[model samples]
Target: GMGKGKSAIESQIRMLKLAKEIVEEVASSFPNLEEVYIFGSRARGDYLDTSDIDILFVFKGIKEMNVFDRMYMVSRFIRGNVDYIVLDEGEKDRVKDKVLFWKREKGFVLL
Candidate 1:
């Protein structure tokens, strides 16, 4: 609280609001979205200034299509070099069966 001009409390509240807005706004556009989850530091409330928004976008019917298409679509929607996972239905189940059981922990936002 340097000089108390801008409280750290206020900054954290604003950050949480903004992150929620971003996820909600994006989710609205994609109706097929099965899950919009966050993992890693942002989820754990231990973010640094440089931590990227780590997220996993699980969609329906991914097995029938090429993953590159999903990757491209996700990339096209990106701003300022954001990284994400746009997993199809198959990949979604696979991750759930294997990785998600352990890694799917709590985060700041769950929309």
Candidate 2:
């Protein structure tokens, strides 16, 4: 069995690390990007082996045009399946509310 189980776990770790690095790099390309975060199963420490990466994109002036453009950009940058939460500056306050408990504890700031 050539330690197949252990090898698979290590491979997943490496992929996760690379995914996070790519997200950070993509964040930097945006001059207006405010903060980057990882949320959902990945950040909450409850992810299963099949879980995909979930990232939060905080930026200013994230109107219709730029939002889709940014989405497309990140989608193109990374290969694996990924989800995003695009929060504009105006919307960050609402997301910060304690009522949205998940947002309070289910995430990690990357940038």
Candidate 3:
């Protein structure tokens, strides 16, 4: 390990904890919020410095928001930038019926 190995571990752990906090904390303010989940490298446990957080926010009905809003909300409690996807209950169900079977097998369900 490099001299910064421990530092990197601390940083990753801190970021994970912060991500969870953001989801939990932010949900209280948004009645539409239904679930929060993560995928990609972070869920797989093999990531790089450039691999940003991939968080999916599921809502109860139709919803939309700007990237700045997403970035601002998630970044406020994360180590860095986050790539988020917002989906309503309908869309989530569609994905589950079609695509999520494979994705869920490989990713983590944070919520």
Identify the candidate with maximal lDDT.
2
What C-alpha lDDT does candidate 3 achieve relative to the native structure?
0.56
**Tens-digit lDDT track of model 2 for 14-81:** 64676566655765676666655556665655555667766666676775546567577566666666
Query: Which candidate model has the greater lDDT, 1 or 2?
Result: 2
Clashes of 3: 0
> Ten consecutive residues with minimal summed lDDT in candidate 2?
96-105
- TM values, all candidates: 0.56, 0.59, 0.56
* Candidate 1 residue pairs in clash (backbone atoms < 3 Å): 43-107, 62-89
Best by TM-score: 2
Per-residue alpha-carbon lDDT of candidate 3 for residues 4-99, written as tens digits (9 for 90 to 100): 366556655665665666666557666667666666666655666555666666666454655466455545544455666666666665333121
- lDDT by residue (tens digit), candidate 1, 2-61: 432344446444544554555555556666656655555555655555556555677766
lDDT accuracy of residue 56 in candidate 2:
66
- Model 1 poorest ten-residue lDDT run: 97-106
Q: How much lDDT does each candidate structure score?
A: 0.53, 0.57, 0.56
Q: Which portions of model 2 show Cα errors greater than 4 Å?
A: 1-12, 64-67, 93-111
How many residue pairs clash (N, CA or C atoms closer than 3 angstroms) in each of the candidate models, in the order given?
2, 0, 0
Off by over 4 Å in 1: 1-22, 93-111
Ranking by lDDT: 2, 3, 1
